[PDB]
From a paper:
The 3C-like protease (3CLpro) is an essential enzyme for the replication of SARS-CoV-2 and other coronaviruses and thus is a target for coronavirus drug discovery. The multidomain protein nsp3 contains a papain-like protease (PLpro) domain and cleaves the peptide bonds to release nsp1, nsp2, and nsp3.3,4 3CLpro cleaves peptide bonds to release nsp4 to nsp16.3 After releasing itself from pp1a or pp1ab, 3CLpro forms a homodimer with increased protease activity. 3CLpro is a cysteine protease with its catalytic dyad consists of His41 and Cys145.5,6 Most reported inhibitors targeting SARS-CoV-2 3CLpro are covalent compounds derived from peptidic scaffolds that have an electrophile to react with the catalytic cysteine (Cys145).6−19 One such covalent inhibitor, PF-07321332 (Nirmatrelvir), has been approved for the treatment of COVID-19 patients. Here, we report the development of specific, noncovalent inhibitors of 3CLpro.
In addition to the anti-SARS-CoV-2 activity, the inhibitory activity of WU-04 against 3CLpro of SARS-CoV and MERS-CoV was also evaluated. In a fluorescence-based enzymatic activity assay in which the concentrations of 3CLpro and the fluorogenic substrate were 100 nM and 100 μM, respectively, WU-04 potently inhibited the SARS-CoV 3CLpro, with an IC50 value of 55 nM, while WU-06 showed no activity. We also determined the crystal structure of SARS-CoV 3CLpro bound to WU-04 at a resolution of 1.99 Å. Consistent with the enzymatic assay results and the binding affinity, the key residues of the inhibitor-binding pocket of SARS-CoV 3CLpro and the interactions between these residues and WU-04 are almost identical with those observed in the SARS-CoV-2 3CLpro/WU-04 structure. The anti-SARS-CoV activity of WU-04 was measured in Calu-3 cells and in Vero E6 cells, and the EC50s were around 10–19 nM.
Author numbering:
A (entry chain A), B (entry chain A): 1 to 306
Write the structure that this text describes.
């Protein structure tokens, strides 16, 4: 029993974190095979950042403008290229600890583990959800750029996030491992801000199924609802609209609990309209939306506490 | 910015998890140097558990009654002993991935990272606090016994918890790495239950200091309080009594924010009496008590957002 925000074991990623220095700036890089990936703003000064032209800044650098430190060892750069908002540094040594890996672009609402690193040294690990406004509510200080987000399936690491910046409201933005930003953000110092956010409806429903799997049914009711009638309530409370694709995704959790998806939507509607009456669900006084259906199946028992 | 329940990177511990089999039971073990540690109830059957005599059960086993699997490799047991509620198995191979480590017994209210493992394979990582009633609110299924809790200081792993059981309310109990249980629990199937719990006052205060460090002061007031007047309110709301030792511990966080400890206690008293008025603190609608002062200093900036 129990239900926690649970990250993937981070060991496979720890053996890939390095330090990258360009001039006076140091940040983290990701060392896979003979390549080190890091944010391209490592080549910028404080003044460059206000209006950088990265093509023009990078042509002025050589291979020996970059220092890569893997633990105690210096790695020699033998090539460099830019891929969107990432710098790719070729190094003289293949990482012996390179795991089986993939680069994936995750979708809003999906979750991943974050390995916070400073000066190439892993510092902490926690679980994050990609918000609908393409930010994450991470925990990051200066020096955290280059930190990565990942999922692990069996022995294969799926890297999906590299950290680049913190926005004025304190939330965080970055790229996939092809250097394409999540969201409309850019790596320059401008007045950009995160857009308005919304609650991840699919995740709230998955989490309510987790509560039933783990033995709690107090929030259910005798009612059902249509997609359209639920989405009218969802609009009022700033929830994402429920789609038929989301209904189909909840199929297995609906089958394990015997609660039809639209019946659980009637439960959620009632929770939104009446509140929770000073009760808790899986220890929470609010509706959690940072667990996907996959996270619930990963963590919960396959047998419901009936 | 940001503030998350953050675990230590788990890689150093992952390289120490093995599988231990005795008869039909399989659970996790901790492999350090030439020794594997695991719960002694691995030698019990379902019937033994109702009333086991572990001295009598263990004398009936040989070295080859135990199978240890480290990844793909079988480790040969060459010795076995019991230390309190743990089995110690000597094996023919020293773990090459053994980190610098220590065994510590943590105190109630302190936190640690948990590496959940099944069949000797790490599954997930999350952060837990030792409750005052000597349980932890973990996330564990059958097969999780032998999973360990740890902290990491620099490159030294301080193991403090090994998982043994889940209690009727769904919370978890276990031992230190000398096999002594936290709390009054025993490794046999009886009617034992977790005692009544209480809120960790020192941690709530540390977390309020984190909120101020990160830029939020809405919950402060112009009042101060004495230790005794606070503890009268603490008794009413099921908070641990505040001691002078706890006041001394908060010294550095008080210095960084310029908020005297007894002034922050006046703030907390007002929060307990008036509620939070539909506001949040560091994203939470409730008062968090699973962050120690050490956790706050570890994660927060050393400069306050004034
Ligand atoms: C704070 N401000 C921005 O982060 C920022 C804002 C904008 Br608008 C654009 C960029 N940009 O184009 O890179 C930004 N990144 C900074 C500029 C140069 C590259 C790295 C810089 N950021 C960090 O070091 C950083 C990351 N995470 C959490 C932090 C917490 C405290 C202090 C710093 C950080
Ligand atoms: C459930 N019941 C107890 O866990 C239990 C209760 C008491 Br009272 C005493 C013991 N005791 O003396 O060991 C217990 N451990 C069981 C007995 C043999 C040793 C391992 C057993 N437990 C687990 O496998 C287990 C651990 N964590 C979370 C779980 C979630 C679901 C199912 C199982 C677990």
């Amino acid at each position: 029993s129990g239900f926690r925000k649970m990250a993937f074991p981070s060991g496979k990623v720890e053996g890939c974190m390095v330090q990258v220095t360009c001039g006076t700036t140091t940040l983290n890089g990701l060392w896979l095979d003979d390549t080190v990936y890091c944010p391209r703003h490592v080549i910028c000064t404080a003044e460059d950042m206000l209006n950088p032209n990265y093509e023009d800044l990078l042509i002025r650098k050589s291979n020996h403008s970059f220092l890569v430190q893997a633990g105690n060892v210096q790695l020699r750069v033998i090539g460099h290229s830019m891929q969107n908002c990432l710098l790719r540094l070729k190094v003289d040594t293949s990482n012996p600890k390179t795991p089986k890996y993939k680069f994936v672009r995750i979708q809003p609402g999906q979750t991943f583990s974050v390995l916070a690193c400073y000066n190439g040294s892993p510092s902490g690990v926690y679980q994050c959800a990609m918000r609908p406004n393409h930010t994450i509510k991470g925990s990051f200080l200066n020096g955290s750029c280059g930190s990565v987000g990942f999922n692990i399936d069996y022995d294969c690491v799926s890297f999906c996030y590299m950290h680049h910046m913190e926005l004025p409201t304190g939330v965080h933005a970055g790229t996939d491992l092809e250097g394409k930003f999540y969201g409309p953000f850019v790596d320059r110092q401008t007045a950009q801000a995160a857009g308005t956010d919304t609650t991840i409806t699919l995740n709230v429903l998955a989490w309510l199924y987790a509560a039933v799997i783990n033995g709690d049914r107090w929030f259910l009711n005798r009612f059902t609802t249509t997609l359209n009638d639920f989405n009218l309530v969802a609009m009022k409370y700033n929830y994402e609209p429920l789609t038929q694709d989301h209904v189909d995704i909840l199929g297995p959790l609906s089958a394990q609990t015997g609660i039809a998806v639209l019946d659980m939507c009637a439960a959620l509607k009632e929770l939104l309209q009446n509140g929770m009456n000073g009760r808790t669900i899986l220890g929470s006084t609010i509706l959690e939306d940072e667990f996907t259906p996959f996270d619930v199946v990963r963590q919960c028992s396959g047998v419901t506490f009936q």
